[PDB]
């Protein structure tokens, strides 16, 4: 399309409404397969090997579509046409419905839709190879992607959308590598999706089996405080990509056997001389099939949304999800008792529907839920933010005289930052004297040997506020 005459141009399309937002403390990186991956004048996928592995910064769906394009189409959609006739064979009613038997594992383009629908902002994309119809997802490529994201500083969150198709051993290995990176840099957090059975349809109360399978994975016990887990998967309103000659048609009359027809959807297209009256029903049926996604893309968007109205120290829970129909499974209180508390400390946060309120996030604990200090997500994220700011503030004094004047200046900077944090409601205490303390000096944390070595040691203590999880009501008959 070219525009050479000044004026107004009118075009008609079918599209979903767009959504943008601006955040700064929730910047995630998405590692996964793409479809084009062409940035500038460079084709990152030009050769089969020696791919260009590079993190790109994007701010909207519109830009993702500029560099990496849209997802590939499915090859499994079946449609059933249900006819009921009278005693003479006269047709009395006709209906149509659609189903998908096995969807592709490449869902990176739909996850970005779900992400931008829930809030968000600047994110990084790491294209690990081109998406394939066969559906092979390899551990080594994801490990190369995670190794490359270590070089970005704006990243605070790590998301692996296409990891539910890996095996348990490869899954555990990848999660261990991610947690090890966060343990080394001390400024990041990981979000995980619980794997659920791949049978159909879902066996009653499977969550209990899935959580026992999850806890049986071997993960480093010292890095568990740097990640979280969520369950189950969510249905959404977005559509699938397909071709008309790959859609398979079945018919059933008066509730009889379901038999496969010999035409494709393209066989009913009026442009090809087919019966368009049923073609319209086939279209309207295909349009209604829900899209299944893991929670993580939506959870990270809700993090970005809630840190902007309440603060990083507020629990990212008890909030509702957008562009969602219903969760795939129903969790009860008795199952929640075992998901939320467990002798091993590994905890699973739930996503549950409540009558009249929509579907909400329910649970805000880390994988170290028995730890008195690192039980909750918000405390750990706040500590990460605070120590990063302190590092950035106390960097300029490198290669300065190691004496009392520098110590005074450093202490002043740290105390001013902590005072600003206290007065906004992040820290507990009636004055700044009861909320935090800072110790730096010869009689506090240092010795002559440390002066000769060139080392500076600072100790910082802080009291944070913690949430209320349980409310107990007691009823009685009034005396009269």
């Amino acid at each position: 399309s070219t525009y050479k005459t000044p004026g107004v141009y009118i075009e008609e399309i079918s599209k979903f409404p767009p959504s943008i937002a601006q955040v700064e403390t929730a910047i995630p990186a998405f590692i996964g397969y793409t479809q084009i991956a062409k940035v500038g004048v460079e084709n990152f996928h030009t050769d089969a090997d020696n791919l260009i592995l590079r993190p790109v910064r994007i701010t909207s769906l519109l830009e993702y579509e500029q560099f990496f394009g849209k997802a590939i189409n499915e090859t499994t959609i079946q449609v059933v046409i249900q006819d009921t006739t009278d005693s003479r064979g006269n047709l009395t009613e006709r209906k149509a419905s659609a189903r998908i038997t096995s969807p592709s594992p490449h869902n990176l383009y739909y996850s970005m839709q779900a992400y931008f629908a829930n809030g968000g902002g600047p994110c990084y994309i790491v294209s690990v190879g081109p998406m394939s119809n066969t559906g092979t997802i390899q551990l080594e490529a994801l490990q190369n992607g995670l190794a490359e994201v270590a070089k970005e500083d704006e990243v605070t969150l790590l998301v692996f959308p296409e990891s539910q198709s890996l095996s348990d051993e490869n899954y555990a290995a990848l999660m261990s590598a991610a947690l090890e990176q966060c343990a080394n840099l001390q400024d990041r957090f990981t979000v995980m999706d619980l794997k659920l059975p791949a049978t159909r349809p879902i066996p009653a109360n499977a969550i209990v089996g899935a959580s026992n399978a999850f806890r049986d994975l071997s993960l480093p016990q010292d890095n568990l405080k740097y990640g979280a887990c969520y369950a189950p998967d969510i249905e959404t309103i977005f559509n699938y990509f397909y071709q008309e000659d790959a859609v398979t048609i079945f018919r059933s009359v008066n509730g009889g056997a379901e038999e496969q027809d010999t035409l494709t959807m393209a066989g009913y297209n009026p442009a090809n001389g087919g019966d368009g009256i049923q073609y319209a029903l086939i279209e309207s049926a295909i349009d209604q099939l829900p899209l299944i996604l893991p929670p993580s893309p939506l959870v990270v968007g809700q993090y970005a949304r809630t840190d902007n109205t309440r603060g990083v120290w507020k629990a990212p829970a008890n909030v509702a999800l957008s562009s969602v129909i219903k969760p795939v499974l129903k969790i009860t209180n008795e199952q929640q008792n075992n998901l939320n508390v467990h002798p091993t400390g590994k905890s699973i946060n739930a996503i549950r529907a409540f009558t009249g309120k929509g579907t909400l996030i329910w649970g805000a604990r880390t994988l170290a839920g028995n730890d008195n200090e690192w039980r909750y997500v918000s405390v750990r994220r706040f500590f990460n933010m605070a120590e990063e700011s302190i590092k950035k503030g106390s960097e300029p004094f490198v290669f300065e005289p190691n004496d009392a004047n520098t110590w005074t200046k450093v202490k002043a900077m740290i105390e001013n930052f902590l005072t600003l944090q206290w007065r906004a409601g992040a820290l507990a205490g009636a004055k700044p004297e009861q909320a935090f303390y800072v110790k730096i000096g010869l009689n506090e944390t240092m010795t002559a040997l440390d002066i000769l070595e060139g080392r500076m040691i600072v100790e910082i203590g802080m009291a944070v506020v913690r949430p209320a999880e349980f409310i107990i009501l007691k009823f009685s008959h009034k005396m009269q």
């Binding site: 500038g40 004048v41 070089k151 970005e152 080394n184 590092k391 960097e395």
Partner: protein
Amino acid sequence: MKILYKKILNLELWHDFYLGQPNTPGSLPNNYDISRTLALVPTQECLRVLANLRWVFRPQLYGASLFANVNAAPSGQFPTIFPIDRVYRLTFWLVVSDRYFANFTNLSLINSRNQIYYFSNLSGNEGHALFLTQPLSAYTTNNEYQLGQLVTHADKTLESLTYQGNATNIPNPSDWDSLPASQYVSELDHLPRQGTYRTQVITNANPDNTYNFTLVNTNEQESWAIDVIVPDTHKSGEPFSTSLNFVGQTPGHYRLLENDTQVAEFVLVDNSLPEAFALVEVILNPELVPSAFSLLQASAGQTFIQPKTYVIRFKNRATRWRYRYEQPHGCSAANLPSYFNLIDTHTYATARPIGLRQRPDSLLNDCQDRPLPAPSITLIQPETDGSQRIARIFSDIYL
């Protein structure tokens, strides 16, 4: 949270206005300082790249330094927190603070307002230092040298004192001085500077064809490309001009090609700091920088730091000193210092150029044995030739 930092780069800037000519260069003195004449300033891309790499920039009394964040190994080798195994590029502005700088710095007096200097670590020139300048040319026979040229010959560095349209087999000692062996700045670093919009001209414009223009940086990566379609009413063989836009590129050295042919080479500028004097580039690429200049070793799946020290150096200007009077002076050709030349009863000048310094060791004596003041650095008087060439340069002292 333990954070260890180690120096990884030394950048020094020399000027003979303060140093002079040592008989054999070593380090600078303990009281060296240019903090009020020259300054190094990182660009924006440089800032965000240093942030991503976890390196720290620091100004110094002699230049600047870089500090890397490393891990303390037992071997004594210092690896970076992560392997830096890609190609990276760091840029810096060089800005001048001292006015009258162009008077004591031995630069080209030819009007150049569309050019800029350029220094890099891809210049070889590893002699007694790591010089970020291009290697000086050699003294040959039958060439043309302008007044002020520095060349190399017989383990020494030669300065030109006058215009020579044709050289000799052996240096003429009345046209060249004899300095110790070192490299300096010369006209080999004066590249044309460009802004956002370009007018490119195609010769022999052929309407039956097309052209693909490209831009290639120092890392040999294509960065930009468009096409231009010559219309079919253009008489074949005439030139054809077109307009080009480089709005989205980062400042630096680039080569402009058209269909597998170099058409131009320039330093691209965005006017973020329009009054900058020079540009400095430092590259991390295991394939393009030799081993004498690189700063990272690769072994056992890791990288280790190697500290280095790069040097840039400027030479002072040399002028002939002319003493001028108000009332007549009584000195004659028979009672004046042999190194003088009587011009008239109110004027006499030196016979050879002398070099401008801040604390000139020894001053000249008068025929009546009296020290004379040295020139000032506020004015210089170049004199053009018949062919509008520079022939002489004086400094006037009014007594």
